[model samples]
Target chain A: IEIRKHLESQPVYIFTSLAGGMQVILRSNNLAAILQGNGIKFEYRDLGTDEEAKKIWKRQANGKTLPGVVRGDDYIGNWQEIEDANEEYRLRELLYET
Target chain B: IEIRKHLESQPVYIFTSLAGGMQVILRSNNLAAILQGNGIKFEYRDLGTDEEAKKIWKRQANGKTLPGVVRGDDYIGNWQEIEDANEEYRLRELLYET
Candidate 1:
C-alpha cells in the first residue's frame, strides 16, 4: 500500500539497506552511484532504519535482499540485475526514458 | 540492441524458455496468465529455438533465468520478482499504466 503509493508518485524508487554489512552497503552504494552517474532522479528508502520501509521491503522483496530497485511500481532486481541491465544498455529506459 | 528495439515498439515483452524444465515452463505460463488475466498485451519470445532471442537474453539477463519481463526496455525481474510486484499491487503501473 505505502510502496504502491510511493511508486505511483515517484518515477524511480530504490529500497536500500545502508546499515547492513559490507556487501549490502557496497551494493546499495553502487545502485545509487549508477543512477546518479546517469543523472536519473530517484527516491532512496532505507529499510534498516525506516520501519515502514522494512515492512514494505518484507512484502515486496520477501525481505531477502537489500538494494531493491523499483521503477514506477516495477520491481527491478537487486544489484546484480541492475548491473546487468546497465551493461545491456537498458538502464536509461528502466529509469525513466521509457 | 534487439531487445531495446523490441521494447521500444512493444508495450510489454516477455522472454520465456518454453523448452526448459518444468519449473521454467510453469513460471513462464504463470507470467503469461497474469498478464492475460489483466488484459494486458505482451510479446512472448522463446529463447529455445530463436537464436536472436537467445542472444538478447544472454545480454539482458546474463542467460541465467527465464521469463525475463521487460517493459519498454526496462528489465523487470523474473517470475519471483514479478509475483512480488503483483502481490504488492504494483504490476499494473509497471506494465503500462505508468
Candidate 2:
C-alpha cells in the first residue's frame, strides 16, 4: 500500500529513540512536553525491541533514524532537527495544521 | 522516520472506522473488550476526527480499510477477519507473543 495514502488522515506521530543516553531522554521529554503543553495531538511509539517499528523508520529514513516525527508518509525529521527547530518553529509548523 | 522502527516498541494499534453504523461500534467494543479482558495491551487512535489515524488505516488496508489492527508495519487485517478469527484464533495469534 502507498504510505501517503495510508497517512492521508493522520497528522502527527512521535518516534523516540529507545536508547540515546541524555540526548534521547532530553529530546523525548522536551518533545513530549511541548506537544502535550500545546495540545498538539500525536501518536507515540518507541524504537527499541519492536522489530516492526524499525521497519517503518527504515522506510521513512531510508535506513536507521531515531527520535523522529511523522505525519502521514512525511518524515518530519529527527530530534536534532526537532530540537533545533523547537516547538515554535519547525515542529509547530509540522504539528499544527497549516 | 520509519513507522516500523518507530513502532518497534508499540505492541498493538487498533484503528476503528469512524462511522460504520452498528458494525463499527460492535466490533470496536468487541475487540477492545477482548484485548482488555485478555490483558492484551494496545494503543488506540480514532479515525472519526483525527486525520492522522485515517492515514494509518489507509496505509495498512491499502485504501481506507477500517476496524483494523496493526503491530508495527504489519496490518493484521480488518475487523471482519479479526472478528471471524476471534481471540481464539487469528487475533489470538497476533495478540499473543507467539
Question: Can you tell me which runs of candidate 1 are displaced by over 4 Å?
Answer: A1-98, B1-9, B62-64, B96-98
- Total backbone clashes of candidate 1, pairs 3 or more residues apart or in separate chains: 0
Candidate with top lDDT is: 1
* Interface RMSD (Å), every candidate: 18.2, 12.3
TM-score of chain A of each: 0.68, 0.61
DockQ-derived CAPRI band for the predicted complex in model 2: incorrect
TM-score, chain B, each candidate: 0.71, 0.63
Q: DockQ (Cα-based) per candidate?
A: 0.01, 0.05
RMSD of 1: 19.6
lDDT of each residue in A5-54, candidate 2, tens digit only: 43335667677543444455456556656655666677655454334656
TM-score of each: 0.40, 0.40
Candidate 1 lDDT by residue in tens digits, A1-98: 34343433465666764345556645665776777677665555545334665666666665556576776545666777779888998976555432
Q: What docking grade applies to model 1?
A: incorrect
> C-alpha displacement of A58 in model 2, angstroms?
1.7
The true-versus-predicted C-alpha distance at residue B56 of model 2, in Å, is: 26
